[PDB]
Amino acid sequence: DVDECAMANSNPCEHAGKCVNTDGAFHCECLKGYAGPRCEMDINECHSDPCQNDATCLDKIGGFTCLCMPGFKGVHCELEINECQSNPCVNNGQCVDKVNRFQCLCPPGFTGPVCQID
Ligand SMILES: *[C@@H]1O[C@H](CO)[C@@H](O)[C@H](O[C@@H]2OC[C@@H](O)[C@H](O)[C@H]2O)[C@H]1O
Ligand SMILES: *[C@@H]1O[C@H](CO)[C@@H](O)[C@H](O)[C@H]1O
Ligand SMILES: *[C@@H]1O[C@@H](C)[C@@H](O)[C@@H](O)[C@@H]1O
Ligand SMILES: [Ca+2]
Ligand SMILES: [Ca+2]
Ligand SMILES: [Ca+2]
C-alpha cells in the first residue's frame, strides 16, 4: 500500500480535510460544510430554504446568511423591524408600523408624513 497522506507534499484531501491512510486508497475527514470522498463538495446549506419572508439565502462555508427583504431582520429574517420605534409622528399623531415604513394617523387639522403641518 501507498501512504498517500505521508508521501504527499500537500494535502491530497480538499478544503483542509484530514487525510487518513487506508489500504489501497485513503480517507478524508471533512470539516463542517464539506462532503465527498475527498471533501471536494461544498454543502449547499440553503437547500433547506432557511430564510423566511421572501429573503434570499446565500450559501456559506458550513452555514448560510439571509438577505432580508427591506424591513425584516433576524437570522432567518423572521422578525419585522418596527419603524415606529423612533416616534416619528409629531402633534400627537398615532404611528402605524408597516413593512419598511410607518404611517402617522393624524388628528383632524394636521397633515404631512409625520403630521408636522398645522
Ligand atoms: C436547512 O433549514 C434549517 C431550518 O432551521 C436550518 O437550521 C439549516 O441550517 C443550518 O442550521 C443552522 C446554522 O447555524 C448552520 O450553520 C446551518 O448548517 C438549513 O441548512
Ligand atoms: C424613526 O424616526 C425618523 C424621524 O425622526 C424616521 O426618519 C424614521 O423612518 C423612523 O423609523
Ligand atoms: C434575494 O434577496 C432578497 C432580499 C430579494 O430581493 C430576492 O428577490 C433576491 O433574490
Ligand atoms: Ca493507502
Ligand atoms: Ca456551503
Ligand atoms: Ca415595520
Numbering used by the authors: 415 to 532
Paper text:
We have also solved the structure of human Notch2 EGF11‐13, which includes the ligand‐binding region (EGF11‐12). Human Notch2 EGF11‐13 has 67% sequence identity with human Notch1, and superposition of the two structures shows that both adopt a very similar linear arrangement (RMSD = 1.55 Å). In our crystal structure, Notch2 is O‐fucosylated on Thr‐470, and O‐glycosylated on Ser‐462 and Ser‐500. In the earlier Notch1‐Delta‐like4 structure, the O‐fucose on the equivalent threonine residue in EGF12 is seen to be involved in direct intermolecular binding to the C2 domain (Taylor et al, 2014; Luca et al, 2015). In contrast, the O‐glucose modifications affecting specific serine residues in Notch2 appear to stabilize intramolecular structure as observed previously for the Notch1 complex (Luca et al, 2015): the disaccharide (glucose + xylose) on Ser‐462 may stabilize Notch2 EGF12 through interaction with Phe‐478 (shown), shielding it from the solvent. Similarly, the O‐glucose on Ser‐500 may stabilize EGF13 through interaction with Phe‐516. The availability of our new structures of hJagged2, hDelta‐like4 and hNotch2 allows modelling of the receptor‐binding interface across all canonical ligands and Notch1/Notch2 and show that almost all of the key residues involved in ligand binding (Leu‐468, Asp‐469 and Ile‐477 in site 1; Phe‐436 and Arg‐448 in site 2) are conserved in Notch2. All canonical human Notch ligands (Jagged1, Jagged2, Delta‐like1 and Delta‐like4) (N‐EGF3) bind to both human Notch1 (i) and Notch2 (ii) EGF11‐13 to a similar extent as assessed by plate assay.
The Notch signalling pathway is conserved across all metazoan species and plays key roles in many aspects of cell biology including cell‐fate determination, stem cell maintenance, immune system activation and angiogenesis in humans (Guruharsha et al, 2012; Bray, 2016). Aberrant Notch signalling results in a number of inherited and acquired disorders, including various cancers, and it is therefore a key target for therapeutic intervention (Hansson et al, 2004; Groth & Fortini, 2012). Both the Notch receptors and the ligands are single‐pass type I transmembrane proteins, and direct protein–protein contact between adjacent cells initiates an intracellular signalling pathway. All of the Notch ligands have a modular extracellular architecture consisting of an N‐terminal C2 domain (formerly known as the MNNL domain), a Delta/Serrate/Lag‐2 (DSL) domain, and either 16 (Jagged1/Jagged2), 8 (Delta‐like1/Delta‐like4) or 7 (Delta‐like3) EGF repeats. Binding of a Notch ligand to EGF11‐12 of a Notch receptor results in a series of proteolytic cleavages, with the final intra‐membrane cleavage by gamma secretase, causing the release of the intracellular domain of Notch (NICD) from the plasma membrane.
